[PDB]
Design a protein around this ligand. Structure first.
Ligand SMILES: [Zn+2]
Ligand SMILES: [Zn+2]
Ligand SMILES: [Zn+2]
Ligand SMILES: [Zn+2]
Lengths: 342, 339
């Protein structure tokens, strides 16, 4: 079958190879992939940024149909639609797994990085770890919920925001788009969206930001303080990569407020220690979520409470998509479409 | 009466002056002071780090005996022993005061900063905010618990350590010594202590530290990772005034560990955002403790679960104490003795 793999000398691009999968084990399933989103993380992995992963099949935003199950599998049956996400397998028995924090398992397998992923016509998954896609959830949208969706949903959980609190999202496009939809439509927060780009802010307004702030035209911090009534927001979710965003996010918190990073800044962030102490603020960050966070994130999509921006492309375009992504030309996700039929 | 106050041009030191206290209001009490500990925060205040507070009486580790009460006071009576802590008065009705988080009150009065403190022979307190010192707790010891002890007790609650977890305390001075005693004797943590001063570490070993690390001799981060079986600690309490302690603290945490900032050196710290994003780590500040945190912290001292290391000094000695503290010379707390 056809797969996108890391090149022998990782150079940022994929090779498109013929690959024959090994036979599945008793606890596994073989999928026929339908979709697989292309992510910034795929670019990093293909570039060698995390080590030389030559020959590894890319993709951790996969959606697929179970074609075969191993003899011990009871969770899935042939014909089920399931997911291939970043969190592909944990060991099941360590402190992180058993405490309910399995993405931190030290023996974690991540799809498209430390184990073959879903950017291929077929993939193997461990059955009990391939989360089912609910009926009601468009499967092209589900591919984006496996990464951007579960990340922003879980980040907003980690923030501790409760109905009626103010939360600000720094960065209106990309992840920010889905962060705004979850914050407003699922958690019942009052939402401020902050961005340098008016177009995207105009879009945020459409998908449920109560207030938008163009950060090129003003200092966001002073306006955020005014909007919330002097104090600041309960929490900030930082979706932007500009270090100034992280600085402004922290500066905007009311006392005991919490900043949750979902992106990492291009240059190192600093905190003023007397402010962290005298205002008791908290900084944390979040990446994807357990299988249960994923199930929940899917269910809100299935109810129509969030709607990711997606478009489809053919597998052969992988390297065009990579260049578009480096050039900054993509709103939301491009999603490789393996389906023949419908 | 004699008081130590912020200088007219704040320079890090005190003037000793004669002050006459105003008459008390109906919800207030007048104290004859017994003791007031010296805290690094007094030095930051006197240096102007938090703005110019020229003329304000310093001190927020005060212990004194109620001499007079206002007409509306029912919580205290003459002869009660009470405390004068950083959290000196909150508004009572804001979302911080009503949710169990009163030290974050934006209208807070802070002893020794925004209101006259306890480093003087007498002090006025707001009676319902002046937490009684339990019998069975030595007043000199109570002075340390009034700031050092309640700050670290509450910081250890904020860290979320549970019995059996590994916790590291950066800085084994006045704050860090008590932090070790609470983490070990009250919370049941396994405790690492990290400092550059070996005598403070030798003391840390005697009062409860399971492992001590001299960080002029070694890389504390690598050592911590070994002690704990490879991953690092569940939490780090930073009681150290050095920027690098804050950064070693973040680095020493296992995934989902939490760093709690207690010391307020006038510094920035570098925040490793990849560490919070990929390893789940949290950084939070903690600010002294509520009136109930202090009552709890005091009860542990009364029961002998913690024992503050203290030495008494004369008020006239306040500027000598400040230089000892800047030189890293103090074990435990120096306590001004008004008795
Ligand atoms: Zn992704
Ligand atoms: Zn595990
Ligand atoms: Zn203090
Ligand atoms: Zn208040």
């Amino acid at each position: 079958m056809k797969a996108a793999v890391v090149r022998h000398n990782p150079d940022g691009y994929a090779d498109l190879v013929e690959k024959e999968l090994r036979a599945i084990k008793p606890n596994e399933a073989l999928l026929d992939m339908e979709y697989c989103g292309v992510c910034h993380t795929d670019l990093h992995v293909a570039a060698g940024d995390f080590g030389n992963k030559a020959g590894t099949v890319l993709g951790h935003e996969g959606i697929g149909i179970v074609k075969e199950i191993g003899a011990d599998v009871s969770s899935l049956q042939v014909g089920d639609r399931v997911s291939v996400a970043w969190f592909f397998e944990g060991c099941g028995h360590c402190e992180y797994c058993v405490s309910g924090n399995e993405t931190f398992c030290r023996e974690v397998k991540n799809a498209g990085y430390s184990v073959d992923g879903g950017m291929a016509e077929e993939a193997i998954v461990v059955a009990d770890y391939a989360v089912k896609v609910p009926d009601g959830l468009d499967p092209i949208e589900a591919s984006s919920i496996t990464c951007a969706g579960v990340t922003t949903y879980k980040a907003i959980k980690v923030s501790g925001v409760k109905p009626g609190d103010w939360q600000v999202i720094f960065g209106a496009g990309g992840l920010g788009n889905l962060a705004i939809q979850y914050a407003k439509n699922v958690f019942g927060a009052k939402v401020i969206a902050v961005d340098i780009n008016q177009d995207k802010l105009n879009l945020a307004k459409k998908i449920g930001a109560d207030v938008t702030i163009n950060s090129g035209d003003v200092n966001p911090v002073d306006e955020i303080k005014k909007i919330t009534g002097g104090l600041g927001v309960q929490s900030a979710i930082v979706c932007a990569v500009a270090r100034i965003a992280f600085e402004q996010a922290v500066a905007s918190l009311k006392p005991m407020g919490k900043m949750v990073a979902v992106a990492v800044p291009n240059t190192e962030m600093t905190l003023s220690v007397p402010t962290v102490v005298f205002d008791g603020v908290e900084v944390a960050g979040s990446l994807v979520g357990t299988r249960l966070d994923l199930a929940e994130a899917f269910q809100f999509g299935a109810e129509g409470k969030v709607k990711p921006i997606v478009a489809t492309r053919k597998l052969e375009e992988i390297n065009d998509i990579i260049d578009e992504m480096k050039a900054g030309k993509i709103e939301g996700r491009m999603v490789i479409d393996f389906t023949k039929l419908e």
